Design a protein around this ligand. Structure first.
Ligand SMILES: Nc1ncnc2c1ncn2[C@@H]1O[C@H](COP(=O)(O)OP(=O)(O)OP(=O)(O)O)[C@@H](O)[C@H]1O
Ligand SMILES: [Mg+2]
Length: 971
DNA sequence: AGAAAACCCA
DNA sequence: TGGGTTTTCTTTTCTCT
RNA sequence: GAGAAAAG
């Protein structure tokens, strides 16, 4: 649309506003105004930018100059131009307070002053100055009184937003002053954009070469520090020259940040660089994005937004603190908005070519700025100052000359360095009051996770009724308000294995040592295994370094959504959706007493973690727990020196943590009045099958995946495993070798993924790879036939064909056909969840202007079922919040304290009915016939999709209220 | 690799 | 009708080219 | 970009 130079100079003038430097903008405006080619292609917005800037300084003569320049070249003043004019007229006492010409022309122009105060975004201080100007004269003007905020009136969301009800909202265990101090700590950790952590490695004792290298790097880094402060000042003068000669320049972009912070950034980029050099454009985009983030943090420090955030957060903590009482209790978004919400003043990203030019300029400073001696091993040897990194040609990756990387490797630097946003928050996160504001204090966290800069996700989120997202945001805040701590005993044991030779049986990666050590094939395989082990140990190193950092601290994990609705915590390395070790390290910081029923749920949780007794009732899982109590107590007491019963569990570290918790609870004097911090888990049987069976009301499926009450749990995977094992015997007696070598190897775990995936649009090749990976990890299985057996295991699993999951397949076929026809119409598949969240699919494999019908078709049934179980999770979260339950969730795995597992069940058995009492299939049908089938050009295609959508398959005969008495719906 | 057919563009 | 490409969906981490 | 690994 607009020219690239227009956006480029718009970014220039905006950054000149943000960095004082206003005579530079006036000079460039004058130079462009002189030349006829240059005075063309300016929009009104750049003169408007210089308008508000001279309004901030209040220079009346200069602003009258640029206002006179507005009328030339056919630009009439817009609303905000008049606003800045009112701001400068009121900044002085001119025109008897701005009415003598400005307000008369304001009324003559036909631009509404109400529309100025409402429609057009203004700064709050500028808005107050306009108020003072238009209050010196005309005192009969007053601001329109803003209404009380709207309260959502949907059927599922009536109960959570009904004012008259008995509520018990949970409060944190931390007082107001402690939470305020943690707010200060988080603010300091976010202003300093990186955090340094100690390695969990074994440290190296002082040696001659190690400390010689250690003092060599300090001298070289200080030398490059002075070199970088030379180069950036030289290019600052050189770019100010281009400003003063009438050229575009990046001079305010380098004055966005101080000299020091840029040099520190470039040094941290060298410290974080691997032995192999990274792509030049990737280094550029990383550097310029870091410049943007540090600018966003710096602008709030200068502009006074940080102090406003301080006062509001100190008032907001009264809701969460144990020692403070809000007069009427309410939700954190509601209490945030009831208090005066600060203006966001959203920093917007610059145009992408300007970002790339900044990254190129910084990286090309970094290339020709740093130098080092070549004679590293011999300091007395005379060597010229060899460039440390010239590989710009090369796909283009810079070269770390091997002296530097060997110097680092013999330096034994004990410190890793993280981003602020890659670390758990030290204070409770900001409430999700908007798709813009939430999670981190000073960083623009996104509502939906996305890649490659897909922006239609937000464009659906900001085009909604304002009360639609209220259910989702209050869910994410509830997921973010969970207080976590680190289980230190598990950390001690894992670091004991990590600092020694690792234990790959229990998940601790092996060192570069104990690696495997005609000939070429074996050497290549040894190098491959060495690289994989080194990579896994680097991952575990980073995770355990954050865990040891947060060992003594209470931290919060802010949550985002994806597009389809499911919720993930923002800090990546150490979260509760990670592996066995990561879940074993994490624990609830707030603890709730067990009560009369908590210890039974702890024991059932332990038996669920062992992986034994999956086919059993709860009474016999509990009887198993009493059977193996001595093994539990020995595993808790002697993990690595006892009989190691916990190691044989399917999730050994979580089993060990639960063994410790159960051992503390049993040996307690009153196990009912024991404060338990362990998250007890409840999981759906087959949630794709659960939601398909509840949509189709299929009695056979509902009985099959436990929507109908039964004494014993029912698994589809154990059914199909025996149903293919009978043919494994029947073909083995015909003398087939592939059936003969699979004896004792047809389990739930090898067919679990395939029968999980049959309800989605799976092909036989994907099922083949699915069983193939599981057969590769089978050590007892001979590895020769792993390919062949995989084919034999996607054959004979046609047992799902014989009228198995029938209404499931009808629902699947209609969703698949709907996605196919929507995409063949040319449109992307969108739908609104029953809680109101709009969902769009970012597939678009044109290059991105057509929808990829294969990807849309294969994506619609999983994305829709994930939307439903995310909505079910959010309803369960909200109605547990009304009953004072601490709830988190790994994507159908609902986690809470043991004392709440009954209540969490009941809400899970209520909001599954209340969600599925609504005609989700019919509401989806009418939404997609209104949104997608109302076009004039494609009446026949709309008729075909109309016949498809209006032929939603009929519900079966299953009363959903039975789910209320289903014991093993979630177990 | 390879056992593998269906969909999309010629 | 003939030839090329994918293979159910999402999320996350690490070192080597 | 491949080498892997993890969660639903
Ligand atoms: N590989 C996968 N592909 C698609 N969806 C998946 C996949 N793995 C899990 N899911 C989704 O996650 C949920 C199932 O999680 P989970 O791993 O607990 O499976 P399950 O069928 O409930 O098995 P289990 O018997 O172990 O409880 C469903 O919503 C399902 O759609
Ligand atoms: Mg499960």
């Amino acid at each position: 649309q607009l020219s690239g130079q227009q956006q480029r100079l718009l970014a220039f003038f905006k950054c000149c506003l943000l960095t004082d430097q206003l005579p530079l903008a006036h000079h460039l405006l004058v130079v462009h105004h002189g030349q006829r080619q240059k005075r063309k292609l300016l929009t009104l917005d750049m003169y408007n930018a210089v308008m508000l800037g001279w309004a901030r300084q209040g220079a009346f003569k200069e602003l009258v100059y640029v206002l006179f320049m507005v009328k030339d070249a056919g630009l009439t003043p817009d609303l905000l131009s008049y606003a800045a004019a009112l701001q400068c007229m009121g900044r002085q006492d001119q025109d008897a307070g701005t009415i003598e010409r400005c307000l008369e022309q304001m009324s003559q122009e036909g631009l509404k002053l109400q529309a100025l105060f409402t429609a057009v975004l203004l700064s709050e201080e500028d808005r107050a100055t306009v108020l003072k100007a238009v209050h010196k004269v005309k005192p009969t003007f007053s601001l329109p009184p803003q209404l009380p905020p709207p309260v959502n009136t949907s059927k599922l969301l009536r109960d959570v937003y009904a004012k008259d009800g008995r509520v018990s909202y949970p409060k944190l265990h931390l007082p107001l002053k402690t939470l305020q101090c943690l707010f200060e700590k988080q603010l300091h950790m976010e202003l300093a954009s990186r955090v340094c952590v100690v390695s969990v490695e074994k440290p190296t004792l002082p040696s001659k070469e190690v400390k010689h290298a250690r003092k060599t790097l300090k001298t070289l880094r200080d030398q490059w520090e002075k070199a970088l402060c030379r180069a950036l000042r030289e290019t600052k003068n050189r770019l100010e020259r281009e400003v003063y000669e009438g050229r575009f320049s990046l001079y305010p972009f380098l004055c966005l940040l101080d000299e020091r912070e840029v040099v520190r950034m470039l040094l941290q980029v060298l410290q974080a660089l691997p032995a192999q050099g990274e792509s030049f454009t990737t280094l550029a985009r990383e550097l310029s994005a870091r410049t943007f983030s540090r600018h966003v943090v710096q602008r709030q420090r200068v502009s006074g937004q940080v102090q406003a955030l301080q006062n509001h957060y100190r008032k907001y903590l009264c809701l969460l603190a144990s020692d403070a009482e809000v007069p009427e209790p309410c939700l954190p978004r509601q209490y945030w908005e009831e208090l005066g919400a600060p203006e966001a003043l959203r920093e917007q990203p610059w145009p992408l070519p300007v970002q790339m030019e900044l990254g190129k300029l910084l990286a090309e400073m970094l290339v020709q700025a740093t130098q080092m001696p070549c004679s590293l091993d011999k300091p007395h040897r005379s060597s010229r100052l060899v460039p440390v990194l010239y590989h710009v040609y090369s796909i283009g990756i810079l070269k770390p000359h091997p002296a530097y990387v060997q110097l680092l490797e013999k330096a034994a630097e004990p410190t890793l360095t993280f981003e602020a946003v890659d670390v758990p928050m030290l204070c409770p996160p900001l409430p999700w009051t908007s798709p813009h504001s939430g999670a981190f204090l000073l960083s623009p966290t996104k509502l939906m996770r996305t890649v490659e800069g897909a922006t239609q996700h937000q464009e659906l989120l900001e085009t909604c009724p304002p009360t639609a997202l209220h259910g989702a945001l209050d869910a994410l805040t509830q997921l973010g308000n969970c207080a976590w701590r680190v289980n230190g005993r598990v950390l001690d044991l894992v670091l004991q294995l990590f600092q020694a030779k690792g234990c790959p049986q229990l998940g601790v990666p092996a060192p570069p040592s104990e690696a495997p050590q005609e000939l070429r094939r074996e050497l290549a395989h040894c190098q491959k295994v060495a690289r994989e082990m080194h990579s896994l140990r680097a991952e575990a190193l980073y995770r355990l370094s954050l865990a040891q950092h947060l060992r003594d601290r209470v931290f919060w994990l802010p949550h985002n959504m994806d597009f389809r609705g499911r919720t993930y915590p923002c800090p990546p390395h150490f979260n509760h959706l990670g592996s066995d070790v990561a879940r074993a390290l994490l624990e609830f910081a707030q603890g709730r007493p067990l009560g009369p029923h908590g210890l039974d749920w702890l024991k059932i949780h332990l038996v669920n973690l062992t992986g034994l007794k999956k086919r059993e009732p709860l009474r016999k899982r509990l009887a198993f727990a009493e059977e193996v109590m001595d093994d539990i107590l020995d595993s808790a007491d002697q993990p690595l020196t006892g009989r190691k019963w916990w190691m044989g569990a399917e999730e050994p570290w979580q089993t060990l943590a639960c063994c410790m918790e159960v051992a503390n609870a049993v040996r307690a004097s009153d196990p009912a009045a024991y404060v338990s911090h362990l998250p007890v888990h409840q999981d759906g049987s087959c949630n794709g099958l659960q939601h398909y069976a509840a949509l189709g009301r299929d009695s056979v499926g509902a009985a099959s995946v436990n929507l109908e009450p039964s004494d014993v749990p029912q698994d589809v995977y154990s059914g199909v495993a025996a149903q293919v094992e009978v043919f494994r015997r029947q073909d083995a007696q015909r003398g087939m070798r592939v059936a003969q070598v699979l004896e004792g190897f047809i389990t739930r775990k090898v067919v679990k993924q395939t029968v999980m995936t049959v309800v989605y649009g799976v092909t036989r090749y994907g099922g083949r790879l699915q069983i193939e990976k599981r057969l590769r990890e089978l050590s007892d299985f001979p590895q020769e036939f792993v390919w062949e057996a995989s084919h034999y295991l996607v054959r004979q699993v046609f047992k799902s064909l014989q009228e198995m999951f029938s209404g499931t397949r009808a629902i699947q076929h209609w969703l698949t056909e709907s996605a196919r026809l929507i995409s063949h119409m040319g449109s992307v598949v969108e739908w609104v969840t029953p809680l109101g969240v709009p969902v769009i699919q970012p597939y678009r494999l044109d290059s991105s202007r057509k929808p990829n019908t294969r990807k849309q078709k294969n994506g619609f049934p999983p994305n829709f079922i994930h939307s439903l179980d995310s909505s079910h999770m959010m309803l369960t979260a909200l109605h547990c919040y009304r009953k004072g339950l601490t709830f988190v969730s790994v994507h159908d795995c609902y986690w809470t304290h043991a004392a709440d597992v009954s209540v969490m069940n009941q809400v899970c058995r209520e909001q599954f009915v209340r969600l599925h009492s609504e005609p989700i299939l019919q509401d989806l049908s009418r939404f997609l016939v209104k949104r997608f089938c109302s076009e004039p050009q494609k009446i026949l295609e709309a008729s075909q999709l109309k016949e498809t959508l209006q032929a939603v398959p009929k519900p079966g005969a299953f009363d959903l209220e039975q789910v209320k008495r289903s014991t093993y719906f979630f177990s």
